[PDB]
Design a protein around this ligand. Sequence first.
Ligand SMILES: CCCCCCCCCCCCCCCCCC(=O)OC[C@H](COP(=O)([O-])OCC[N+](C)(C)C)OC(=O)CCCCCCCCCCCCCCCCC
Ligand SMILES: CCCCCCCCCCCCCCCCCC(=O)OC[C@H](COP(=O)(O)OCCN)OC(=O)CCCCCCCCCCCCCCCCC
Ligand SMILES: CCCCCCCCCCCCCCCCCC(=O)OC[C@H](COP(=O)(O)OCCN)OC(=O)CCCCCCCCCCCCCCCCC
Ligand SMILES: CCCCCCCCCCCCCCCCCC(=O)OC[C@H](COP(=O)(O)OCCN)OC(=O)CCCCCCCCCCCCCCCCC
Ligand code: SF4
Lengths: 41, 156, 105, 98, 70, 311, 80, 175, 110
Amino acid sequence: YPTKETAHWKPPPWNDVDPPSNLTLNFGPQGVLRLVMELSG
Amino acid sequence: SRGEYVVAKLDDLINWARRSSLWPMTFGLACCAVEMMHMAAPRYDMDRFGVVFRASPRQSDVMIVAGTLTNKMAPALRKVYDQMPEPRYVVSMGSCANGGGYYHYSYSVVRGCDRIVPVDIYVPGCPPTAEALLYGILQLQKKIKREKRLRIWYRR
Amino acid sequence: PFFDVQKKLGVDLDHWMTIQSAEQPHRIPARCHAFEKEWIECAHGIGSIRAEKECKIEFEDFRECLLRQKTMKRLNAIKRQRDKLIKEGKYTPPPHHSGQEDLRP
Amino acid sequence: MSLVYMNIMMAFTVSLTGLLMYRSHLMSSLLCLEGMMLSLFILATLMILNSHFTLASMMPIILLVFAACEAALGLSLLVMVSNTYGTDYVQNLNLLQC
Amino acid sequence: MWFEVLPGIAVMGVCLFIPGMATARIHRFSNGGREKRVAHYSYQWYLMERDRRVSGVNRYYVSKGLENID
Amino acid sequence: MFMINVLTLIIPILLAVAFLTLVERKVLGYMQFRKGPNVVGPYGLLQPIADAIKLFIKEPLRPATSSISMFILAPILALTLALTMWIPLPMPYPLINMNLGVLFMLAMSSLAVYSILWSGWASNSKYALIGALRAVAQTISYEVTLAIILLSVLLMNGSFTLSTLIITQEQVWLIFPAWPLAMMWFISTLAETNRAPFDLTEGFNVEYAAGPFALFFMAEYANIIMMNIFTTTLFLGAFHNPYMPELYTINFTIKSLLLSITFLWIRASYPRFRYDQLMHLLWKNFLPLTLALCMWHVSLPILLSSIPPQT
Amino acid sequence: VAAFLKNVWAKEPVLVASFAIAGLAVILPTLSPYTKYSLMINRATPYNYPVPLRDDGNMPDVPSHPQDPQGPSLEWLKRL
Amino acid sequence: MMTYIVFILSIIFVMGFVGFSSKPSPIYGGLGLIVSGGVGCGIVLNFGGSFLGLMVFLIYLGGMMVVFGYTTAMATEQYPEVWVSNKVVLGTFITGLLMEFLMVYYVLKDKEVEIVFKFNGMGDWVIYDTGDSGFFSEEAMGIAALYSYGTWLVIVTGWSLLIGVVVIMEITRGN
Amino acid sequence: MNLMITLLTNFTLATLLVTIAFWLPQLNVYSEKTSPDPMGSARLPFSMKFFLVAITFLLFDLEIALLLPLPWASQTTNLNTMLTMALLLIFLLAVSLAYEWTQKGLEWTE
Ligand SMILES: CCCCCCCCCCCCCCCCCC(=O)OC[C@H](COP(=O)([O-])OCC[N+](C)(C)C)OC(=O)CCCCCCCCCCCCCCCCC
Ligand SMILES: CCCCCCCCCCCCCCCCCC(=O)OC[C@H](COP(=O)(O)OCCN)OC(=O)CCCCCCCCCCCCCCCCC
Ligand SMILES: CCCCCCCCCCCCCCCCCC(=O)OC[C@H](COP(=O)(O)OCCN)OC(=O)CCCCCCCCCCCCCCCCC
Ligand SMILES: CCCCCCCCCCCCCCCCCC(=O)OC[C@H](COP(=O)(O)OCCN)OC(=O)CCCCCCCCCCCCCCCCC
Ligand code: SF4
């Protein structure tokens, strides 16, 4: 029975699964070289 | 008087402790880093003066600008200088850090690191020999020795 | 559902930790070994309904051995009366409760 | 009943009231739950040492080990929640209303 | 040469020698010229408090020998 | 009189940690074909005093702390746990003679990672927090083999008493029946204190000033000297005459100095491990051997009828 | 079963040493003669008081004084 | 004053849970639970439970609360706080902790002594040294009996720990 | 009692050295400095591997907590049962380690 508080409740997905980056470092000058790292763990 | 004597002896104490325990953050910019490495090498051996080898920038006492300061890295130089606790000091090593050197008229070179940071000791040479860099370090220690911090505090 | 497997097969899985009066290591007694032994030997085999009303004296002796509420009540009464008499000035403590008597052994 | 046992029970009920009124985080729930476990350890230990009941002295360690393993399980659950939403917020755990 | 490290090693060795020597001398000073009584167990503590009661001066380390019996 | 004994423990600990910096710089000097400090004092004997007065008047960095309380309680906990690990150490008689001094030291060293974790969260940096989490994971990893090796050795002792460990080794050193436990214990204590080749912090507490960094520094070196003394008592236990305790004190002092200089001589010899390589060293090399030797030192006094006395 | 053993001793000597030490720790307490002496020493260690018995009249195996012949003796422990 | 020390620790223990059951943050929650674990361990150690107190430190605090602080520090994104020079960054900490010990000493007032003095435990509560035990801690031998008497207990405990390892590795996979 | 005095003295010396380390250079009127690292404004990504090694520490630490009364359990009369349960606990710690091995749990921090 759709009441006032229950009207916006959409039904759950059929297979019960729900729709859900990596680190980027800057090794700066702190020879000399800067390193932008897309690291993944 | 008495308090003048006390602040003079405590000035001697803190100046002794600061000059005999200088920890350098060496910018390895260019060829002068090689001669700094020879100044840390066994023959000249900075470590026996209390001058440790490759201290971290957030505890170091003296910044040695050893090599060519270019325009792409001058903000990084001023950033590492601003991250140094006081009393911080700057030793400029070699001609490109002193006044631009062999790349003075270049489009990309800071003409002296004293356009960026306040510089205490200018070490001349291309590169200065490691013995001469060590001379500049000992002249910095003698400059720290004649500081008058608590004397000027007691007189102001 | 109490499937008493330990009595069917004849294994001792957890009876040993159950009561204090069981076989302890190096024959250490509990503080209330006699009182719990008497409550268990009284209330044995007669069921809980008869055990509540027909072994209440041993059970209250064992409960008072555990909690010591009547003993702490009695000591609080005697200590309160002693404090009130020391406060009134009608009583003096003995030397063997004040610490000047060079203890027994 | 006794006094220091009443204090350890008071701590158990205080961490229970903290475990029954959630503010923001699931880690706060796990911390109140393990404060409850700590108070159970303390109270069991004082009873077992009080009566000089010897064989039960292994019991609080047992009461530790299982329940600490239990806490490990709870931490892993929190992590999977924090891998779906980025936070461990209990208000992200409301998809089972329907 | 290599023997130059020996003053610092000697200073550090004296700094490690001082606590053990200190606690041994304090244990002999506070216990009648002897070792401190070790009571890890209830029997050792019971004998120790029995010594404290039989000495008469509230000190366990005063040993009463055969002169205290008739 | 007991407070005198506490001060005569804790002041020479701080003096020994101060001069360990001099011994480290001199021994690492001569091993690197150079000299160490000799300009400041005679042969460098004023270099620790100059370094301490320099670090204690150096400017505080004005730290942008994520918390006040953990920023203050990480050096406090570091120094307190650095000092309280010494009080059950038998030299030949400890400051606090306790029946579970081994377990006490294992507990107080397991509590020593909170200084790392609170220093990490008390910084605003995510990179400093990642480095602190890596350091905490390393330290709690190697605490596993600390506990198992320590248990396996104390299966020959009888109890967790550290003074009983002197009585255990009156006929032979305990490194003879337990040298694999000795070498894995020594590498594990090397990897506890983030000492080289396990020093990936120099490869987390830089949010602090130079003064509080000196506090973490001196707590780390007190842990180094303490674990060397504990390893000396645990494996190379010296002769003890109860009428002359200075024989035992000089003997374990000399052995502790040699083992601390063995740390100084390891750090001037090897490159660093990569992080997963020392996790491989723990979880895949030291832990199977350590578990097998735990089974071995359980079942071996039973088969040789050499079960040590409880008391 | 022998070339595999040489292969695993070449590749992974740590796990071979671990399984060898663990296998010896399992089997060797039963293959030993001195294992029974562990049991005997732990059951002859007097943590409690040896509570005496009332002499009913016929107990030949129970002594009356510690310096009597009958009673459990530890000559084997003193000699070994 | 010194007699009621266990009771004093218990009061602090109760106050310690009010440090974190009000839940200011999970990180300060962990900090309050560590302080509470230390004072409850002091309560345990002052009845002669030395091994159990060292299990509080070694396994509860140094074993498990390390993991709680570790998992908390891998969440709850941080932000800076007040970082003025030393009249704020340490002076407010010292005044706050002095007010905390003021709160500890402040609760021992006339509403407390009606419970303390009518139900005086110290004098007759701590009775663990009632007579002699011998050459052994009774608590140590009771924990030692886990291997001879506790065969089923050790079997189900080690099986639960092995199943704990398996369960954690299955739920923390995502596949 | 002596232990509490020693802990209190160690805590007092620690707090005194921290207080000296904070208040002694704050005598200086050096400079109020401005303008506040490998990330500038990046959030922290979670890493599953660090949590796996933390929970692995906790579970093996519980197994060590079981293994701790062995120097006392060696003194018991039922040595066959004691030896069987000691070897069984260390074998279950080894089985937990082998299951951590073969399911790739010890990888990229091996
Ligand atoms: C207590 C005082 C000190 C004690 C001694 C320690 C002082 C010496 C220190 C030297 C410097 C150390 C520098 C850092 C070391 C770190 C690197 C390292 O070595 O890692 C460990 C290395 C690691 O080896 P690894 O890293 O080369 O292995 C590679 C592994 N794979 C192939 C998987 C990639 O070795 C060990 O783990 C061995 C530990 C000791 C083993 C002892 C076994 C004893 C014998 C058992 C029986 C064997 C035979 C079988 C049965 C026979 C029966 C009859
Ligand atoms: C357990 C072992 C612990 C050991 C710890 C100590 C290790 C080091 C041992 C001593 C080493 C040598 C110390 C002296 C170094 C040199 C000091 C000196 O004389 O400096 C000269 C300087 C200039 O004076 P000036 O008169 O101008 O000289 C020109 C010549 N006319 O004038 C001055 O500098 C002024 C005078 C300063 C003198 C300071 C001397 C050192 C103080 C050390 C204090 C701690 C000592 C140990 C305490 C605990 C044990 C008692
Ligand atoms: C962030 C806060 C501040 C951080 C820095 C300070 C706190 C952390 C660092 C210090 C840790 C304190 C540890 C205190 C207990 C240590 C364990 C212990 O007491 O073991 C020794 C001993 C057991 O050995 P045993 O020989 O059996 O005893 C005598 C029997 N004849 O047992 C004894 O001798 C018992 C002696 C009496 C009981 C002592 C109780 C101490 C007070 C309560 C705990 C205080 C700390 C609370 C906060 C902890 C936070 C980590
Ligand atoms: C019964 C006694 C008690 C036994 C239980 C207690 C043992 C104590 C040690 C516990 C060790 C726990 C972890 C064991 C995991 C075994 C599986 C394994 O490691 O397989 C992988 C490995 C191949 O190596 P890889 O995958 O490349 O390694 C990564 C780094 N390169 O594969 C291998 O290296 C092969 C490893 C398995 C075969 C080893 C055989 C050793 C035989 C020694 C002599 C006989 C000993 C008697 C007992 C028989 C043991 C099999
Ligand atoms: S001054 Fe000259 S030699 Fe020196 S770093 Fe510059 S370019 Fe190289």
